[PDB]
Amino acid sequence: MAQLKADLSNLEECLPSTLSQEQRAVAKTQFYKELAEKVHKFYKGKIQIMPKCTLAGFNWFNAYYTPGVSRISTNIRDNNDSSLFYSLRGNFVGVVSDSTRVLGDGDVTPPGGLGVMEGKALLMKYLGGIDAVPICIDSKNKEGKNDPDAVIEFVQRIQHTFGAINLEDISQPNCYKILDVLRESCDIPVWHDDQQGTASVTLAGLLNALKLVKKDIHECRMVFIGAGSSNTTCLRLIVTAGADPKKIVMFDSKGSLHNGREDIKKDTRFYRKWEICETTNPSKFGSIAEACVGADVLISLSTPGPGVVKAEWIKSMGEKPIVFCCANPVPEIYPYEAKEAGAYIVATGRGDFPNQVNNSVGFPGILKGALIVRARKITDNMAIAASRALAEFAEKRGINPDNIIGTMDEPGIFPKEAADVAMQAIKDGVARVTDLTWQQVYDIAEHDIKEARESAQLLQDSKHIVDFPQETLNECLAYAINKVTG
Amino acid sequence: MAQLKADLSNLEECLPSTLSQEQRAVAKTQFYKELAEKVHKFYKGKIQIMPKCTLAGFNWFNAYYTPGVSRISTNIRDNNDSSLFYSLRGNFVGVVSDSTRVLGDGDVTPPGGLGVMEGKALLMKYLGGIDAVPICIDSKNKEGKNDPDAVIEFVQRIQHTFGAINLEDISQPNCYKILDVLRESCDIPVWHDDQQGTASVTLAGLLNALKLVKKDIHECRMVFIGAGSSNTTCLRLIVTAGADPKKIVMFDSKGSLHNGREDIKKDTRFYRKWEICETTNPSKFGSIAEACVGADVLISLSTPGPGVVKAEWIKSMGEKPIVFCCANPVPEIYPYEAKEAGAYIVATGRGDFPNQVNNSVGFPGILKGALIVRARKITDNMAIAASRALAEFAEKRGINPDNIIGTMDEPGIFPKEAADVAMQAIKDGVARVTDLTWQQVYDIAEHDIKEARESAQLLQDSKHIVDFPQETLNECLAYAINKVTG
Ligand code: NA
Ligand code: NA
């Protein structure tokens, strides 16, 4: 009977009432997987390059090209900073990955990260008014090992094209060295989305969840399952934001993190883990299950599910448990099971369940802010300033257990983030532009965003972007429904 | 007196009658440099990123991003070639430069090449239907010398992002090593626009120039001023197309090329000049002036900086001299100086003089053709096919001493280049897509270029690209005039 609308807004209604809750969840994930396959091929990707300058007539090329363009090359040679306003550089972000950790799918090979990086680049334009491209590279050295110095050298060479570097999907602990070095060696800001960007949105999420459960951040026990770059960065911001590290426990694959973890202390590449080891889990919990009894908050970024976070764990938590399970493409548990177990607030990293806690609602504002005041780097306080803007944006339009965080469907989030991030950067002493107010940044970010969204809509109404075929949609739903019944 | 039109078509008439020929030439140069400065700052560059996929509703992000995008990650991992259609890669060109030979300005530091590489990317979209971005890199090693191996390594790592690589503005002999190695090692086509690109359009102009003066290619004495990477490739294509090597002389800084250059002999980084030493200029001409008397064709692309072509060399040439002076931003001699000295046909690299012999009129068509049928390499044959296509397109609508070649205002040149280059790639055995006909390839090129042009036009007509202020046009004019009248 039911048929998807072109805007996909009625997917829930098109899934037969006969499916179980695990069948709806698995069908949702199969639909979007099969649809991704079809849509990417239909349009041959997701982004394109366009003029943004007047093409009124042939002779404009004499100013864009020879002979006129020569003044640009000499102006830049003599004053490198003018590359920021004479070329797209000022608004141009490289989305650099070696594809070693592309979502929960792992090392997907060097071109393998294109779908994800191209999606980041798309969201940067449409959400953030930022021009960005995917830069998927091979970081393998001559011995066939993915090598942090290969990526460091690369970015140092390519920095001159860009206004910021946005590292993505790089396995740990390479990603720490890559970022720790680049961030101080480059003349443009470099950061790792998976680090402060995930951490930023995770905090923003927790901030509002804590207002809805009426607890103070400092009194809350919190369990962190998985100890990769996202989770370690989340814990760090959460503590800076007022959480008591003594009430916190993190787990890697070998057990809990604590004083006695000599395996972690001796390998300094894992210094972020080792700091957590020195400062949290004073009780040295041996198991997740013990750690969760009474816990207030469970934050997971581990192996893709099903069944990695256990219903029993959640059942044993305190009053109005907050559960974030953000592994991709499949969360550690589906939201219907966690609510069955008693969770009051459940978040995942995907857009097809409520409460999407995903850096896509953080990077565009963090990046745009940093670009506008030319911040030298992305500081933790900047990241936190964006956590606050996002949490406050959502609160001020209404929040509840099934809507705790700003969504990708609310463009207003991003100039708010950009202006707060910009002022924090001036405050932290890392901005090179200091002559702009909160309002002036907001206005710049707002305009670029509106201009980006109106251009792209115009190109859709006119059918330079062709409508996707109704029939391929019908085919993706049948495909999804067949997988979970047949 | 007239003010400049929005479309810049009437600059000649806005330049005062009383100006001398020298003043008029210099004032055009200064006008376009000063307008380049103003317009690049006005739009903060020339190109932008834009969605090319449907954004009909929020849930679409679930296909473009987590969770759906994971299908793309794994699809690519298991079939790397599918990257060419599940992402922009299949139509994505990197304009790679170390900014070491950027026009006649030469080495402008790494970010200094951005003006020129952005104009190239702007042209690939608007003339060729190609998505392209500037990639300006630092190639300097620790000792601060430009290192070809750095460029080789860099491109090898980034190749995974792109459907082709378009090397630009790399100093010789580095450009040879980089091109020659990369074209064999990368799994996409790599070429150097200043090599086959420039030689493609140079041959095209020569073809029509020769028709106009009624001379057979093989019966012309040709003198080449400069042994740079452009001129070298110009000579080589012009020989393959049928010139007599015995009737040809090339000059470098130290005098004519001939088989007695021990000089060039053992430095095998310069093997291309060496092949030319073995095969040309049997006579051992002892000065450019000795060479030029009775010559038919004189071709210079001195890079960098200002080259020399003398009035007296031209005056000594034969019946109806053909003179190409393509140095940018100022040619070796201006057209009116070459005309006064007896030249019948004169080309420069600029669009503000007749007969613009510039790669911008060959690269959009070459790359587009190569991209469609997935050519592994850009062969010399393929470059030559584009030349015949360019020259024949021009001859069909009429050629004359002041209009010998197709212009950037004639968008039909490029689907025709694309289809001829494609067929040639199949014939050369470098095409990975072998069963499309000329018409099928033409159709794809034409449809892409038309979509790109109309998309761009819609964005201007809509005011998303703002009209450039008339007041600033008027200022640039006055500025230019003022520079020349004091
Ligand atoms: Na969610
Ligand atoms: Na010209």
Numbering used by the authors:
A (entry chain B), B (entry chain A): 1 to 486
Structure paper excerpt:
Upon incubation of rEhME with Eh cells or human enteric cells (Caco-2 and HT29), it was evident that EhME binds efficiently to both.
The catalytic triad of EhME is composed of Tyr65, Lys120, and Asp193. Due to the knotted structure of EhME, two monomers engage in inter-monomer swapping of these motifs, contributing to the formation of each other’s active site. Notably, a sulfate molecule in the crystal structure mimics the 2′-ribose phosphate of NADP⁺ at its binding site.
